[PDB]
Symmetry: D3
Subunit: 175 residues, 6 copies
C-alpha cells in the first residue's frame, strides 16, 4: 500500500515520518519531492575495493555543477569552456555522490523508495543506480549516485532531484 | 498491494484503469506488458539545461532500430555496415527517447511502475533510467529512456518492451 | 504491503516462500540479502538480436572478479597489472551476467523485487539494470546484470550482492 | 480491507463473487443489500439437542408475516385479530428461520459478513444473532434467524432484510478441499 | 485493515474522520469509545409497521435510567420501588432507543463498526442488536438500541456505552451522491 | 484484512499469536474454532449496578448443561424433569457466563473478533451479544455470555462454541503500556 498525499501529510504531522526540512508544496499525489544538497563526494582511488577504506575528495558548490558521462575526456580547456558557457561552478565526468537536503526518519511500519526525478530521467541523468528501497527504521539523509548517460547535464543547488515513495509494511519490523 | 492478473482484468473492464490499446494476452501474473512505439526523439544540443527549451529531432522508423552504447564511435561506414548486416532502419549511439504504444489513465487509488523487460535487461538494454513510478491520476503514454550498456541491441517496432506493475494506494490521492 | 522480517521468517518457515540456501542472519527489517554466485556469463557476439540464439562464454571464478566500466580499454598488460595488484581471478569490461547462490520459489500471492546492494551502489556498481520485479509463481535463481559506471569494482564470491523485497499481491495470481 | 461499491461491481462482473439474482441498485457504498425469501421454518421440539435432527414445519407466506417476541402468547383469538387488523398471512412468536432470496459464492480470497438492516434494528427486529461472518469458499443462500425483541414486527416478502459486507483476506485460503 | 490508535489520531487531526466532541483519551488500541446521551425514545404502538411513522415518546434523564428486560411487568408500585432504592430517574422495560453524544463523519475510504462495550455485555446489556457496520460517507450521531436480556441494568448519562471500530476500504467508495 | 488459515498457522508457529491449547484442526478457512469450558457463572442480584462487584455463583458441570430462555420459570419439578429426560448436569434460565478453554495472546498488529458458531445460531443459542472485537495486545481466555432466545438448548463441555476472526491492523497499535 503506497501512501497518498493525505497519508504523507498525516504521518509528517504526527511525526511518524520525519522529514527535515519539510515543504508541503513538495507533497505529490503519492510521493514527496526531495532536493539536491550542495555537497558532493568524488572518489580518488584506482579501483573500488569494499574491503578497504575508500579515499575521496569533498566538493561543495555555490550554485551548479555540470555532470558529464564517463570517458567524456575532460581537458583543462574543455572545463574552462563549459564553466564560461554554462556558468557552472564545477565540472565532473563519471560518477559523483551527492545528498538530499532532507534528513528523514522512518518508523517500523514504513519502507521508502527513492527514485530520481522524471524530468532528469528524460535527459538521461540518474541520481540513483539501485531500486532505492530504504529500510523501516532508517535515519539520515539520502545518498545520491549521480551519473549522466547521454550528454553533460547541469544540476542546481537545492533543485528538486527526485521523490520518496512511501509504502506500508505488512507488519512492523524489528529495527 | 500489487494487483494480480485478476485485478488488472477487472480494473480495465470497469475502466478504472485505461489502457489503449489493450490485449488480454499481455496480462501477466501481476503486471501488464506494454509495447514499443515507432517514434523516437534524439536531442541535438551540446548539454542538458532543464532551465531552457530543449532542441531535438523526431525520428520515425519502419521496422527496427539499432541502439549502440555511448561513445561507440559510429562512422558512416559502420552505420552502413550495421544497416546491411542487421537490416535496421536507423542506428543511434547513446541515449534515445521512445514511447509505448499504449496510452494509459490511472485512477486516484492506483500508482503504477514501469520496468524494462527482463529479456532485454539480460542483454544490458534498459528502457528506463529511474525506478519508474507513475502518479495516481496520470494520463498519457509512457516515455521510454533507452540506453544500451554493453553492446549494440536491435529493437523492433511494436515488440513488448516492458511491463506496468500496478499498486494500490493506502488512500485516494488528491490529483 | 511489503513483508517485514517477521513475515519473511514466517513465509520461509511454512515454505510459502522458498529460499535455498537460507540464512536467518540475512533477514533485514523488510528484505532478504542474497549472495553472488561464482558463475558468470559473457556474450561474445557482435550485437544483441533477441530473435536469435545468443552465443556466450561461461566463466567460473575461484574467489573474485574485477568489473571495469565499458570501453575501459583493457589490454594484456592492464589485465596482468590488475590481477597482480588486486589478486582478482578474472578481469572484465562492460556487461557480465552473474547469479545469486539462492534459488527461490514464490507463491501466487507474493511478488518480489531484487535490488542491488546499497554499499555497491555507492561505488557505482549495479547488479540489475531493471526495476527487478519478479512474478508471483516464479521459480529459479536470480540472474544478475552487473555493470560498473565509474571505476573498476572488485566483487567477491559468495558476498552479499543485493536484497529481495517481498510484496503481497492484492489477490492471488493465476500462475 | 472492505470492498467498496466499485470492488463489488468488479468481482460480480468477472464472477469472482457470485450473487444470484443480482441487482446493481442493491450495491451500497461498501455492502450489498439482500432480500427476504417467502419460505420460513419453525421448530417443533421441547428442547434443542444438536445431536438430533430437529423437527420443524415449513410455511410459505403470500406477502407478509408478523413476528412477535417470545412468550407473546398467541392464541387463535389473538392470531385472527392480527391477521385481520394488519392483513398478515402468518403470525408467529419467538425464533423463526428465514432465508435470503440471494444465492452467493465466495472465492478463496474473500470473506463476507451478513448484518440485519439498521432500519429494522431500530424497531428491535433482528435477522441474525451472531456476528455472521461467512467462510471464504462458501456457496449457498444465507440462512436467517429472525427474532423480535420488543413488539411484533411486520416483515414483507422480498423486502430488503440485510446487507453483506465483503472483506479481503490477507492471503488466499484453503477452502477445505480441492478437485482435479 | 483496522485503524490503530495512531491512525485514528491522524485521521481526526486532519479531519478525514470527524468526531464531535473528541476526547483523545477515548482512543483505544484499535477503536474509539463513545458515550451515552441523555435522551431516549420509547415507541408506543401495538405492532411495528415500517410503512408508517411509529408513535413514540421522548424522555430526558437527569443522571440515570434502569433498563429492565422485556415482560418485566413494571407497575407503578415496582417503578417507585426501583426509583427510590436505586435512585434512578426513569425505569423502562423492553427496547429503548438512545443516542451517542458523539457526532461523526466518515470519509469515502473508511467504514466504521459500532459495538456495545464488553463490560456491559458481561451483564447482558446491549446497545445494538445488529453487526452495526456504518457506511463510508456517513454523517451523524450513532443511534442506539438498548435491551437488557437478564436482569435490569442501570445506565448513566455520559458513560462510555460502546466503541467505534474503523476499517479501511479496499478502494474509495461512491457515497451515493456528489456536489459541485 | 482477515488472516486466512495459512496466516493463522504462521502466526501461531512463530508465537506472534498465542493460542493455548492449540488444535491445528480447529483452523478454518479464515478463523479459529474455540471450545466451551466447563465452568459457568450465574449472577445473583436484583439489578445490575456496575459501580459494585456483582454477586454470583460458580458452577462446574460434568458433561452438559441445559440453557433455557429467560422467564422460562424453572421449578424444582421442571428441573428434575429435564435432568432426567435429557441427562443434563445443570439446568439454568436466562443469561449465564461461560468461558473458552482457549487462552490467547494478541500482538500489537492484530485484532480478533469472537463470534458464536452458526450451527448454534440456527437454534437461537448465542454465546455473545455484542460484536465481540478484542483489542490488539489482549491476553486471556474469552468470556462468553450465553443466552437462548427460543427454546432450551443443550450445550456440552468442550464442544466447539464459536470462532475467532483475526484481522490485521493498519499500523502497530500502542497496547496501553510498555515495559523495560
Ligand atoms: O519516462 C517517463 C517519465 C515520466 N513519466 C510520467 C510519470 C510521472 O508521474 C510524470 C512526471 O512528469 P514531469 O517530469 O512533468 O514531473 P515531475 O518531474 O514529477 O515534477 P516535480 O519533480 O517538480 O514534482 O510523467 C512516465 O510515465 N515515463
Ligand atoms: O535478471 C533477471 C531477469 C529476469 N528474472 C525473472 C523475473 C521475471 O518474472 C522472469 C522473466 O523471464 P523472461 O525474460 O523469460 O520473461 P518476459 O521478458 O516477462 O516475457 P514477456 O515480456 O513476453 O512477458 O525471470 C530475474 O529474476 N532476474
Ligand atoms: O544511496 C543510498 C544508499 C543507501 N541508503 C540507505 C538505505 C539502506 O537501508 C541503508 C543501507 O546502508 P548500508 O550500505 O550500510 O547497508 P547494507 O548494504 O544493506 O548491508 P547488507 O547488504 O550486509 O544488509 O542506507 C540510502 O538512503 N541511499
Amino acid at each position: 500500500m503506497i501512501l497518498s498525499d493525505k497519508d504523507i501529510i498525516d504521518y509528517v504531522t504526527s511525526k511518524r515520518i520525519i522529514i527535515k526540512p519539510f515543504n508541503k508544496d513538495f507533497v505529490g499525489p503519492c510521493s514527496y519531492d526531495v532536493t539536491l544538497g550542495d555537497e558532493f563526494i568524488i572518489y580518488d582511488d584506482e579501483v573500488y575495493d569494499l574491503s578497504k577504506e575508500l579515499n575521496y575528495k569533498r566538493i561543495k558548490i555555490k550554485n551548479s555543477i555540470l555532470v558529464c558521462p564517463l570517458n567524456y575526456n575532460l581537458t583543462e580547456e574543455k572545463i574552462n569552456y563549459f564553466k564560461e558557457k554554462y556558468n557552472v561552478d564545477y565540472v565532473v565526468e563519471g560518477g559523483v555522490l551527492g545528498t538530499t537536503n532532507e534528513y528523514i526518519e522512518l518508523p517500523n511500519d514504513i519502507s521508502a523508495q527513492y527514485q530520481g526525478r522524471s524530468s532528469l530521467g528524460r535527459v538521461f541523468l540518474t541520481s540513483h543506480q539501485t531500486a532505492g528501497w530504504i529500510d523501516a527504521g532508517f535515519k539520515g539523509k539520502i545518498t545520491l549516485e549521480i551519473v549522466a548517460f547521454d550528454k553533460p547535464v547541469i544540476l542546481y543547488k537545492n533543485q528538486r532531484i527526485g521523490q520518496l515513495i512511501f509504502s506500508k509494511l505488512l507488519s512492523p519490523a524489528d529495527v
